[PDB]
Amino acid sequence: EYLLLTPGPLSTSEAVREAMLKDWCTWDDEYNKDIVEVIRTKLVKLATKHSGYTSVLMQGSGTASVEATIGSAIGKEGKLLVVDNGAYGARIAQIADYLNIPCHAVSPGETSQPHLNEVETALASDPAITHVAIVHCETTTGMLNPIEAFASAAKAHGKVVILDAMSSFGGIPIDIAELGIDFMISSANMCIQGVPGFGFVIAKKTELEKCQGQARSLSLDLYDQWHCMEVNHGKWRFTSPTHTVRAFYQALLELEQEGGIEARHNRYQTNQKTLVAGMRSLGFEPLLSDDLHSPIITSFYSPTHSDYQFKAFYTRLKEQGFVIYPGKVSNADCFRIGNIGEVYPADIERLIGAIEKAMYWQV
Amino acid sequence: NEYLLLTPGPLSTSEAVREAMLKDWCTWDDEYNKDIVEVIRTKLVKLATKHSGYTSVLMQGSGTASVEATIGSAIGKEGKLLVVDNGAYGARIAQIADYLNIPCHAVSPGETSQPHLNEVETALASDPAITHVAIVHCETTTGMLNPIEAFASAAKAHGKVVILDAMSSFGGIPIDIAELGIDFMISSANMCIQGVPGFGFVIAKKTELEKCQGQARSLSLDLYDQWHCMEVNHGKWRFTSPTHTVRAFYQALLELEQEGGIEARHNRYQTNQKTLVAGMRSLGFEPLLSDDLHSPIITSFYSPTHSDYQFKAFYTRLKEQGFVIYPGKVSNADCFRIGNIGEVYPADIERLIGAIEKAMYWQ
Ligand SMILES: Cc1ncc(COP(=O)(O)O)c(CNCCP(=O)(O)O)c1O
Ligand SMILES: Cc1ncc(COP(=O)(O)O)c(CNCCP(=O)(O)O)c1O
Ligand SMILES: [Cl-]
């Protein structure tokens, strides 16, 4: 019943959920070859039109895939450069800390875009960096980060590039081979519009090969997981979330049917721009300037009316069939509205009407 | 439902457990965290013990991620593990300790043998550096039921922390983890509870779980941090959880209560397993283990010694009749397995025995 205006888990189509009504055996080819290997093939082609890439699927939250990448790719003498401008870049630094990996972090603040000169300066002044981690859509605020110039700078400096594309892959066109991304992480449940249960890594095969024997976790051993899928035709070393994987297979078919990432991006971009215009017509201000907006999720300042309360606003909107999202900026009073999943222009129009009816602090 | 999965899990789930997945949830909303997650947590502790002092943590990923979260979070920098290795899951515990650089002494009596309490006792007495012990309750490798009471009792007498891998027993074999002196019991969403895969869980003695704070070797698998967030944020999972699989689990817990609880499920499983063994013997099949070592969960049988017998051909012929059996997992034994859990009833075992006979192409 609710329309979830979240970044994911979000409102999935009826067919994506119905695809979960079948049980699968984890040791049978009908699952491994017919479902898993197909997802792997499709994911690589979605990420790039070029050769040399491969995919690995990993059980757990998308954070477990980010952690599997960091912990498996970085050697004993490695150092990670993190571009931190929100919770996800900060979480990458936190993973490095847990795994005792030295970290250089450029942290301009949660509402600031990192400048190319900041990444270039870190690379030029710290030769110990071996790896660079960047976030494509910083979901914290919904900022769209300029990943091309950062990846380009890192590659020119001979670094391995890790991209957290959790909230962008499948909704924002990117060719990870052209961008020079060595490891791209993304989610089953955001722009692809599947359900949560696993994440995945699309990696340059020669870079993934270097991960062998370097892992800091058995569950999160990226090369071991990949090797098993490679030689055992899709087999996950340990139990996988079968139903969610089959839902993902369905989500990939619906993305092809929509017209691919280009068509999905166009829908998302139209939803986001329509939402921003609608919100401005009601007196809401986006937290970020329009040039920094992603087409995925948008942060808005909380109304400054003395009677405004997020909980009361959230409840009134839920009563009208819409679930909005908490702000994630520690120094700003804000909220978020995603426009992905089963969200179409007609939904944005109904939403704007519902937000006006939920503005209890105004006649 | 083309097949009945005679696997240890993922298995054949009820229609209501799968139908429960047809709803989307917001990971930041109380209708999911308080109404679904906190209820599962409360129910899981009461299922594990009738006593106070215990708590639960849910962890995204395979059950292995939960075992690894326990080992990596519970064991300090100077800790040492004693593990009984009498199958693949005891061996995997030793492998996790190796990945995490945790000193580990394995007691390996063989995969068709129960650990000798004298060897365990001697290993404990002669090595005061051991801080932790681990054992697998139902060794799914063979379907062996391990003697956990005497093992846990010996470890407790030696002042050790007891870890129980009850992946394939919890919910199908009556146990009171407080009475047994288990400090951490790991189990999964998709075995005797009959949910779908997606997450595992740990039921721990609260005072023991508290010692895990700050000791974790993984952010994703930080047991105390995951628990603390669920405790103070009313069910909130730090990172995205497999919502649909969690809601399916909530439904699986209701169906276990409706069945008559662990006592009734155990009785069904015991009857299934004993009926299956008698049926298999009538066809000339020999179980790997002596009857006194059988768990009521899954049974391993020796491969027929006919020169034309091949597991793949037998497996296919059974699939054609609507049954999915399971490959053998024993070191130095040619064998196969048949689970009798999930939506498996006496009438299914009877149909299975008929189907096994029709699949005996070499006779
Ligand atoms: C950009 C970005 N990177 C990582 C993650 C973490 O994904 P998981 O929650 O671990 O699957 C996210 C997640 N954002 C949506 C979930 P939230 O609870 O709001 O963090 C992300 O956007
Ligand atoms: C006793 C026991 N311990 C751990 C596990 C591992 O669980 P996950 O596969 O990681 O969820 C199991 C699993 N057995 C069933 C799956 P299989 O592919 O046969 O290992 C277990 O039984
Ligand atoms: Cl419901």
Side-chain angles (χ1 to χ4, degrees):
Chain A
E1 206 91 328
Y2 303 128
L3 182 61
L4 306 176
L5 302 161
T6 64
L10 36 70
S11 291
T12 58
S13 71
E14 308 268 84
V16 162
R17 274 170 289 128
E18 240 133 46
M20 302 195 271
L21 300 180
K22 180 170 170 179
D23 294 308
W24 299 95
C25 174
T26 57
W27 286 73
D28 187 83
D29 291 352
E30 289 181 31
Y31 172 67
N32 293 320
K33 288 181 185 176
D34 302 350
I35 306 304
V36 180
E37 291 289 88
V38 171
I39 287 167
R40 289 182 73 218
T41 302
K42 289 185 172 195
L43 284 171
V44 176
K45 290 164 186 173
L46 282 180
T48 183
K49 65 180 161 175
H50 308 280
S51 55
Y53 283 76
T54 192
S55 61
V56 205
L57 313 185
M58 176 60 63
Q59 299 94 321
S61 61
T63 294
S65 281
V66 175
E67 187 169 347
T69 303
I70 292 167
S72 304
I74 310 184
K76 291 165 184 175
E77 293 315 304
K79 179 174 196 184
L80 178 64
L81 170 61
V82 193
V83 183
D84 156 27
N85 73 327
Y88 306 103
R91 190 171 297 167
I92 282 163
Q94 184 181 26
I95 290 166
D97 179 34
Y98 263 82
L99 302 178
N100 300 302
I101 290 164
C103 190
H104 187 138
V106 328
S107 311
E110 301 174 304
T111 61
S112 299
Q113 216 187 38
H115 195 287
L116 177 60
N117 288 348
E118 291 200 276
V119 172
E120 180 52 40
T121 293
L123 287 166
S125 76
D126 186 2
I129 291 156
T130 49
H131 292 75
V132 180
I134 47 175
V135 179
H136 190 188
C137 169
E138 237 301 352
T139 325
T140 305
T141 52
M143 188 176 299
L144 183 52
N145 287 331
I147 65 164
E148 180 163 355
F150 296 163
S152 186
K155 291 271 110 203
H157 280 93
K159 311 317 183 177
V160 170
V161 177
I162 302 170
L163 179 62
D164 173 355
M166 210 76 58
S167 55
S168 60
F169 178 71
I172 303 168
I174 69 175
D175 184 309
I176 66 168
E178 288 174 5
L179 294 175
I181 306 310
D182 295 306
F183 298 87
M184 188 212 73
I185 303 97
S186 196
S187 178
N189 57 273
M190 303 184 93
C191 302
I192 300 295
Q193 299 171 188
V195 303
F198 68 97
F200 47 89
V201 183
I202 308 174
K204 182 173 172 178
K205 197 181 167 172
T206 53
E207 292 297 339
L208 179 53
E209 281 163 355
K210 298 187 194 199
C211 297
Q212 185 172 14
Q214 293 195 157
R216 288 170 176 87
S217 163
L218 173 67
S219 295
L220 310 182
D221 188 330
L222 199 68
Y223 174 92
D224 196 44
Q225 183 91 330
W226 176 72
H227 178 71
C228 182
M229 294 180 170
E230 284 290 285
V231 302
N232 302 126
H233 317 307
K235 175 65 168 53
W236 300 57
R237 294 176 299 154
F238 316 134
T239 302
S240 61
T242 54
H243 310 82
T244 78
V245 170
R246 178 57 183 85
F248 191 73
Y249 176 104
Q250 204 60 37
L252 292 174
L253 284 170
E254 299 193 336
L255 173 55
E256 290 154 5
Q257 292 177 287
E258 189 180 350
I261 299 174
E262 284 299 334
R264 180 155 298 177
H265 182 234
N266 290 342
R267 173 166 58 100
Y268 285 177
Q269 239 187 11
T270 295
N271 283 351
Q272 198 272 164
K273 286 184 180 76
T274 300
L275 172 71
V276 171
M279 292 296 280
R280 286 197 163 119
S281 77
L282 292 175
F284 288 95
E285 187 188 356
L287 173 71
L288 308 174
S289 51
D290 286 20
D291 64 297
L292 299 178
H293 290 185
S294 65
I296 307 310
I297 187 151
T298 310
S299 297
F300 296 92
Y301 281 109
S302 290
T304 61
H305 191 289
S306 296
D307 294 321
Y308 175 78
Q309 177 198 76
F310 177 70
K311 180 193 172 85
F313 182 48
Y314 179 80
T315 304
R316 272 153 183 88
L317 273 170
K318 267 181 85 178
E319 285 160 14
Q320 297 184 79
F322 300 97
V323 169
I324 62 161
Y325 213 60
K328 199 182 192 69
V329 179
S330 53
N331 305 319
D333 208 311
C334 67
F335 64 95
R336 284 172 296 162
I337 308 172
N339 56 256
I340 69 160
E342 290 305 287
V343 175
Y344 298 91
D347 298 302
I348 297 298
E349 287 306 87
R350 290 170 328 102
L351 171 64
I352 298 309
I355 282 167
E356 186 172 20
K357 286 186 176 181
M359 296 173 71
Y360 64 85
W361 62 87
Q362 203 175 95
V363 172
Chain B
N1 283 33
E2 177 182 9
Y3 304 128
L4 183 60
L5 307 175
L6 303 162
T7 65
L11 37 75
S12 292
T13 59
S14 73
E15 193 185 274
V17 162
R18 273 171 290 124
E19 242 131 48
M21 301 195 273
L22 301 180
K23 181 170 171 179
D24 291 311
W25 299 95
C26 172
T27 56
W28 285 78
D29 186 81
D30 291 351
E31 292 182 31
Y32 172 67
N33 293 319
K34 289 181 186 176
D35 302 350
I36 306 304
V37 181
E38 290 290 88
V39 170
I40 288 167
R41 288 181 74 217
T42 303
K43 291 185 172 194
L44 282 173
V45 175
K46 290 164 186 174
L47 281 181
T49 182
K50 66 179 160 176
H51 309 280
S52 56
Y54 282 76
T55 191
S56 60
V57 206
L58 314 186
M59 177 60 64
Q60 301 95 318
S62 61
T64 295
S66 280
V67 177
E68 186 167 351
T70 303
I71 294 154
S73 306
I75 309 184
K77 291 179 182 176
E78 293 317 304
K80 180 173 193 181
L81 181 64
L82 177 143
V83 61
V84 160
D85 164 22
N86 69 337
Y89 306 103
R92 189 174 297 168
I93 284 165
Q95 184 181 23
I96 290 166
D98 180 32
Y99 264 78
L100 302 179
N101 302 302
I102 291 163
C104 185
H105 180 246
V107 170
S108 307
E111 294 168 18
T112 58
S113 299
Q114 247 172 16
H116 204 298
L117 313 157
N118 289 351
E119 194 187 335
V120 172
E121 183 59 30
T122 295
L124 289 169
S126 73
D127 188 1
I130 292 156
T131 47
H132 293 75
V133 307
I135 193 167
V136 177
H137 189 185
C138 170
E139 234 305 351
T140 322
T141 300
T142 50
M144 164 132 58
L145 183 54
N146 273 336
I148 66 163
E149 180 164 352
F151 178 86
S153 186
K156 282 281 133 209
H158 280 92
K160 311 317 182 179
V161 171
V162 178
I163 301 170
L164 181 63
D165 170 0
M167 210 64 76
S168 56
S169 60
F170 178 71
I173 304 168
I175 53 161
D176 185 309
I177 66 168
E179 286 174 5
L180 294 174
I182 307 309
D183 296 306
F184 298 88
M185 188 214 74
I186 302 109
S187 192
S188 102
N190 60 269
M191 304 186 96
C192 301
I193 307 296
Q194 301 181 193
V196 303
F199 67 96
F201 48 88
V202 183
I203 309 174
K205 183 174 172 177
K206 197 181 168 168
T207 53
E208 292 296 338
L209 179 53
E210 280 164 350
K211 296 187 196 197
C212 297
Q213 184 171 15
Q215 293 196 157
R217 287 171 177 88
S218 165
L219 172 68
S220 298
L221 310 180
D222 187 329
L223 200 67
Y224 176 93
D225 195 45
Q226 184 93 327
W227 177 70
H228 178 72
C229 182
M230 293 181 171
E231 283 290 286
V232 301
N233 302 127
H234 317 307
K236 178 64 169 45
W237 299 59
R238 297 174 299 155
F239 316 134
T240 300
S241 59
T243 55
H244 308 81
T245 79
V246 171
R247 179 57 183 85
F249 192 74
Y250 176 106
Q251 203 60 37
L253 292 173
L254 283 170
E255 299 193 335
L256 173 55
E257 291 155 4
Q258 292 170 323
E259 190 179 351
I262 298 175
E263 285 299 333
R265 180 155 299 176
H266 181 234
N267 290 343
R268 173 166 58 99
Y269 285 178
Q270 278 209 294
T271 297
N272 284 351
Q273 198 272 165
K274 286 177 173 80
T275 300
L276 172 70
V277 169
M280 293 297 282
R281 286 197 163 117
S282 75
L283 293 174
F285 288 92
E286 295 162 42
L288 241 76
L289 306 178
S290 51
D291 286 21
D292 63 299
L293 300 178
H294 290 185
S295 67
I297 307 310
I298 186 150
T299 311
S300 38
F301 299 93
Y302 284 117
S303 294
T305 58
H306 189 289
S307 60
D308 295 320
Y309 173 77
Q310 187 213 38
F311 178 71
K312 181 190 181 177
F314 182 48
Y315 179 79
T316 305
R317 281 169 219 251
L318 274 169
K319 266 180 83 178
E320 284 161 13
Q321 297 184 80
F323 300 97
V324 169
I325 62 160
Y326 214 60
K329 203 185 191 70
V330 176
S331 297
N332 307 318
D334 207 310
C335 67
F336 66 92
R337 282 172 296 162
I338 310 174
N340 54 252
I341 66 164
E343 291 306 286
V344 175
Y345 297 88
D348 298 302
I349 297 299
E350 285 185 79
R351 290 169 329 101
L352 171 65
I353 298 308
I356 295 280
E357 186 172 20
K358 285 187 175 193
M360 296 174 71
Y361 64 85
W362 62 88
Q363 203 175 92

